[PDB]
Design an enzyme around this catalytic site. Structure first.
Site, short mmCIF file in Angstrom:
data_model
loop_
_atom_site.label_atom_id
_atom_site.label_comp_id
_atom_site.label_asym_id
_atom_site.label_seq_id
_atom_site.Cartn_x
_atom_site.Cartn_y
_atom_site.Cartn_z
N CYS A 1 -56.78 5.96 -5.29
CA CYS A 1 -57.62 4.97 -4.62
C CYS A 1 -57.47 5.00 -3.10
O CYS A 1 -56.36 4.97 -2.58
CB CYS A 1 -57.32 3.56 -5.13
SG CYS A 1 -58.35 2.24 -4.42
N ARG B 1 -56.96 1.17 -0.83
CA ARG B 1 -55.66 0.49 -0.87
C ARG B 1 -55.20 -0.35 0.32
O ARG B 1 -54.18 -1.03 0.23
CB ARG B 1 -54.56 1.48 -1.28
CG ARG B 1 -54.56 1.78 -2.77
CD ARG B 1 -53.45 2.74 -3.14
NE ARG B 1 -53.72 4.10 -2.68
CZ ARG B 1 -52.87 5.11 -2.80
NH1 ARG B 1 -51.68 4.91 -3.36
NH2 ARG B 1 -53.22 6.33 -2.40
N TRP C 1 -65.28 -2.25 -3.88
CA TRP C 1 -66.65 -2.11 -3.41
C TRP C 1 -66.91 -0.63 -3.23
O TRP C 1 -65.97 0.16 -3.07
CB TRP C 1 -66.92 -2.90 -2.13
CG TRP C 1 -65.96 -2.69 -1.04
CD1 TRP C 1 -65.82 -1.59 -0.26
CD2 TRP C 1 -65.05 -3.67 -0.53
NE1 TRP C 1 -64.89 -1.82 0.73
CE2 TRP C 1 -64.39 -3.09 0.58
CE3 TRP C 1 -64.72 -4.98 -0.90
CZ2 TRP C 1 -63.43 -3.78 1.34
CZ3 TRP C 1 -63.76 -5.67 -0.16
CH2 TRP C 1 -63.13 -5.06 0.95
N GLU D 1 -69.64 8.07 -3.22
CA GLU D 1 -69.56 7.96 -4.68
C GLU D 1 -70.95 8.06 -5.30
O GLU D 1 -71.19 8.83 -6.24
CB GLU D 1 -68.96 6.62 -5.09
CG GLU D 1 -67.48 6.42 -4.75
CD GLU D 1 -66.93 5.09 -5.27
OE1 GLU D 1 -66.63 4.99 -6.48
OE2 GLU D 1 -66.79 4.15 -4.46
C1 HEM Z 1 -61.50 -2.69 -1.74
C2 HEM Z 1 -62.32 -1.69 -2.21
C3 HEM Z 1 -61.94 -0.48 -2.80
C4 HEM Z 1 -62.41 0.75 -2.45
C5 HEM Z 1 -63.24 1.09 -1.22
C6 HEM Z 1 -61.93 1.68 -3.42
C7 HEM Z 1 -62.32 3.01 -3.51
C8 HEM Z 1 -61.96 3.93 -4.50
C9 HEM Z 1 -62.56 5.23 -4.67
C10 HEM Z 1 -63.53 5.91 -3.72
C11 HEM Z 1 -62.04 5.73 -5.81
C12 HEM Z 1 -62.40 7.00 -6.50
C13 HEM Z 1 -63.43 6.70 -7.58
C14 HEM Z 1 -63.90 7.95 -8.29
O1 HEM Z 1 -64.09 8.99 -7.62
O2 HEM Z 1 -64.07 7.90 -9.52
C15 HEM Z 1 -61.11 4.78 -6.32
C16 HEM Z 1 -60.31 4.96 -7.44
C17 HEM Z 1 -59.39 4.04 -7.95
N1 HEM Z 1 -59.18 2.80 -7.43
FE1 HEM Z 1 -60.12 1.95 -5.88
N2 HEM Z 1 -61.13 1.06 -4.34
C18 HEM Z 1 -61.14 -0.26 -3.99
C19 HEM Z 1 -60.51 -1.23 -4.71
C20 HEM Z 1 -59.76 -1.06 -5.84
C21 HEM Z 1 -59.12 -2.16 -6.54
C22 HEM Z 1 -59.33 -3.63 -6.16
C23 HEM Z 1 -58.36 -1.58 -7.55
C24 HEM Z 1 -57.55 -2.19 -8.53
C25 HEM Z 1 -56.96 -3.45 -8.50
C26 HEM Z 1 -58.58 -0.14 -7.43
C27 HEM Z 1 -58.02 0.83 -8.25
C28 HEM Z 1 -58.28 2.20 -8.26
C29 HEM Z 1 -57.84 3.10 -9.30
C30 HEM Z 1 -56.79 2.89 -10.37
C31 HEM Z 1 -58.55 4.22 -9.12
C32 HEM Z 1 -58.48 5.40 -10.02
C33 HEM Z 1 -59.78 5.62 -10.75
C34 HEM Z 1 -59.67 6.70 -11.80
O3 HEM Z 1 -58.56 7.24 -12.00
O4 HEM Z 1 -60.69 7.02 -12.45
N3 HEM Z 1 -59.45 0.14 -6.42
N4 HEM Z 1 -61.08 3.68 -5.52
#
Ligand code: HEM
Ligand code: HEM
Ligand SMILES: C[C@H](O)[C@H](O)[C@H]1CNc2nc(N)[nH]c(=O)c2N1
Ligand SMILES: C[C@H](O)[C@H](O)[C@H]1CNc2nc(N)[nH]c(=O)c2N1
Lengths: 420, 420
Positions: free
Chosen positions: A118, A121, A290, A295
């Site tokens: 992610c 973070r 968000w 994406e």
């Molecule tokens: C504040 C906004 C956030 C942004 C901009 C963001 C952005 C991203 C992006 C770009 C990815 C890759 C997605 C993909 O290519 O499939 C990702 C993956 C991930 N994010 Fe975030 N994220 C945010 C918030 C969160 C939150 C609030 C959580 C959890 C409490 C989180 C947990 C994760 C996890 C676990 C992945 C792994 C996804 C996977 O393994 O398929 N994210 N995030």
């Protein structure tokens, strides 16, 4: 014996026999950095039959509690001790244990803070937690999900949040959402041989159809929420259209762009992930952040396994489509990207471009390193699908590692569920 | 104790303490996939003092010979046996051994074929080998290098080739080129605080200056060949300007582009790498392929640590430079990329765009897998610095592993050389 390597584009699979002839030790590993692999058994937390053995559970629990209480600026030793005592006792009394609210909160943020893939973070401290641990029916799940989707969307002003359902008990009374993500369009294999909608959700759509879902046969049909409570089979619930906020795609210069009839949902919520914390594991806890432009613009719209619009958006731009070296693809994608960012900004729906996103992550890494002395990062995932080296995180060396709490992947429920 | 993590953009270094708190086993490794690391000790083959111990050398030699003779469609058993016999004997007689020409050839191609970070590997069968193993002086090195640079360039119609200097003897009579790559511009830290030329070659330039090199203080001053033979100190030789073919940059639409006064050499030759094969190691064996657009257009021209032209090329395009979200960077880079490809095509200098390049590699992987059952691939390197997911190799799972023969990195000679 050999390693299975899949190409997510053609879906073709390969069997690597050669790795056995590897020299000695590679980077941190001996004969292979399988960092390129999508779903490694190491990032997955599968099924069960028996509860978590006390000898394991207890230490893990003690560990997590030492993490929690060691957190606050001025430790509440007495309560720290008291909690350790109360937990040890509660564990040896029931076989499992319950987390205080402030514990789940702290847990969920740390788990996110520990997600190597992610990029958002830097927002770890701002997260909403919906305590659905006392939930008990599929219908009740649905109501909780709707509330989440409602709170999260907030009329375009998207808010990060997670709704944690009941933890794991034995291993056959699991609450699981069968969807990939909360909101997600369907994909149908049409009569004339073509595919309509999101080709990625083909197998799942058929499942929904098998569970008697009304196939609306379109390009942007939001799939139904397939829920399963306490072991019980999956009950199909359709999401209230009033809850699904979408953004219609339109370019700030190319007026023919909206003629493409494109749009996409504004809510990125990961549904099918498990939350491990202090020996406890919640196989149902959808979270959302968000969108980050790339994406949708690059992955969702330009993949061959997805909507695959590149050929068309390229053509309407009047580019040399039959000449790879003309970099028409590079030109088209960027415009599609501007379209998305524009359309979201215009319709006041929170979104962030990949550059601003990378710059905030680098800042996060520094905060993280200075703070706890490290930050688990999966370069392969953190670097945007376009403009790689134009981004700071590309020139940044990272260490990818699994800590705790952590958000693990799971085995797709339809493969391992015992029907009744 | 901790791991050193460097950010190649700011040059800043970080110390990761957290990884110690890792769970159990990660992907193929336990507590960290350091696949993101640039120069891991695992991809490097350092110094020596004593020859290669017979007990090690012998098996390795036997292994390599079994690989060689097992190659040809109809094995020459007698000669296979004869060679094994002749080698074993030669080894136990001298302490080292010499490879037949057809062996070095086969070696060099396999080593390339085993380079996990090279995308041009579909060209593995077409390679020129210059046998400079009998060389003995710095001056003689220089003459060999010029011949290489000459043959390789071929007036724009670039040809892949490698010139293998004398193998390793004891470990203090090593032939080493101190340059990063055969042809490479210089970087000087100017009086008014600025940097001119390639900022990456700042430390090396000063070295050249220390060894009495004439600083021509410019933006595109081809650095001198710093050679060292048989232990002897490094003698500085300047490359004959008639040998250095360059391409001046000009855009097919933006006529103001050539006003930037940009250009770049047409020859991509890696100088400072070591070749390991059958226990033998050649610390001097520069090889070259042909440029892949993105190297120059994205890395060389748009990095902060390099020429850093993005701000300017963006401005002259009239883009919202002070607005990250306008994707001006995405727009500029692509145009710079077209410029390069155009300028090379125009001046009839072999080059390949990243798309055509990725598509040929995927084909290679299939040929490689069907043939030997595997293909060592470093995703991080194989995926272009721009248009990642628009490329096939992005959606391709790979296994990164060190085989043999292999092209290892080395310790920068000025740190470990004993001056005389
Ligand atoms: C504040 C906004 C956030 C942004 C901009 C963001 C952005 C991203 C992006 C770009 C990815 C890759 C997605 C993909 O290519 O499939 C990702 C993956 C991930 N994010 Fe975030 N994220 C945010 C918030 C969160 C939150 C609030 C959580 C959890 C409490 C989180 C947990 C994760 C996890 C676990 C992945 C792994 C996804 C996977 O393994 O398929 N994210 N995030
Ligand atoms: C036929 C043309 C070739 C093309 C298009 C090609 C392209 C590439 C590219 C794009 C890189 C990455 C460079 C960087 O980012 O620093 C690379 C790396 C590499 N290539 Fe090639 N290559 C070709 C031929 C060769 C040949 C003939 C050899 C050796 C016999 C070779 C050996 C390698 C090695 C060892 C690396 C690693 C460089 C490093 O670790 O710094 N390549 N190649
Ligand atoms: C095979 C390869 O690991 C895979 O296609 C990856 C690479 N990087 C990624 N990174 C992000 N953000 N999202 C992805 O799905 C992927 N997929
Ligand atoms: C830190 C990171 O590993 C580093 O910047 C990488 C990534 N991928 C790369 N890939 C190529 N082709 N060339 C490079 O120099 C790099 N550098």
């Amino acid at each position: 014996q050999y390693v299975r390597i899949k190409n997510w584009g053609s879906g073709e699979i390969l069997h690597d026999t050669l790795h056995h002839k590897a020299t000695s030790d590679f980077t941190c590993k001996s004969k292979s950095c399988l960092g390129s692999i999508m779903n490694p058994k190491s990032l997955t937390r599968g099924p069960r039959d028996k509860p978590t053995p006390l000898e394991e559970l207890l230490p893990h629990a003690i560990e997590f509690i030492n993490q929690y209480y060691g957190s606050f600026k001025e430790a509440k030793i007495e309560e720290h001790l008291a909690r350790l005592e109360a937990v040890t006792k509660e564990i040896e009394t029931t076989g499992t244990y319950q987390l205080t609210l402030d514990e789940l909160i702290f847990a969920t943020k740390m788990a996110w803070r520990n997600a190597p893939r992610c990029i958002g973070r830097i927002q770890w401290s701002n997260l909403q937690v919906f305590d659905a641990r006392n939930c008990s029916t599929a219908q009740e799940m649905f109501q909780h999900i709707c509330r989440h989707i409602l709170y999260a969307t907030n009329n375009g002003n998207i808010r990060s949040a997670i709704t944690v359902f009941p933890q794991r008990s034995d291993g056959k009374h699991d609450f699981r959402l069968w969807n990939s993500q909360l909101i997600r369009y369907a994909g149908y294999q049409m009569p004339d041989g073509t595919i309509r909608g999101d080709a990625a959700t083909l197998e799942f759509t058929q499942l929904c159809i098998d569970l008697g879902w009304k196939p609306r046969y379109g390009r942007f049909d939001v799939l139904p929420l397939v829920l399963q409570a306490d072991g019980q089979d999956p009950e199909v619930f359709e999401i209230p259209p009033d809850l699904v906020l979408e953004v219609t795609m339109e370019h700030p210069k190319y007026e023919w762009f909206q003629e493409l009839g494109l749009k996409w949902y504004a809510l990125p919520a990961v549904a099918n992930m498990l939350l491990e914390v202090g020996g406890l594991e919640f196989p149902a806890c959808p979270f959302n952040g968000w969108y980050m432009g790339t994406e949708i613009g690059v992955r969702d719209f330009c993949d061959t396994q997805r909507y695959n619009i590149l050929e068309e958006v390229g053509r309407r731009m009047g580019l040399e489509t039959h000449t790879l070296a003309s970099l028409w693809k590079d030109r088209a994608v960027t415009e599609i990207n501007v379209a998305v960012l524009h359309s979201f900004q215009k319709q006041n729906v929170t979104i962030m471009d990949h550059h601003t996103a990378s710059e905030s992550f680098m800042k996060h890494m520094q905060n993280e390193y200075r703070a706890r002395g490290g930050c688990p990062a999966d370069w392969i995932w953190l670097v945007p699908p376009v403009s790689g080296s134009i981004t700071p995180v590309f020139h940044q060396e990272m260490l990818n590692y699994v800590l705790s709490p952590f958000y693990y992947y799971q085995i797709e429920p339809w493969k391992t569920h015992i029907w009744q």
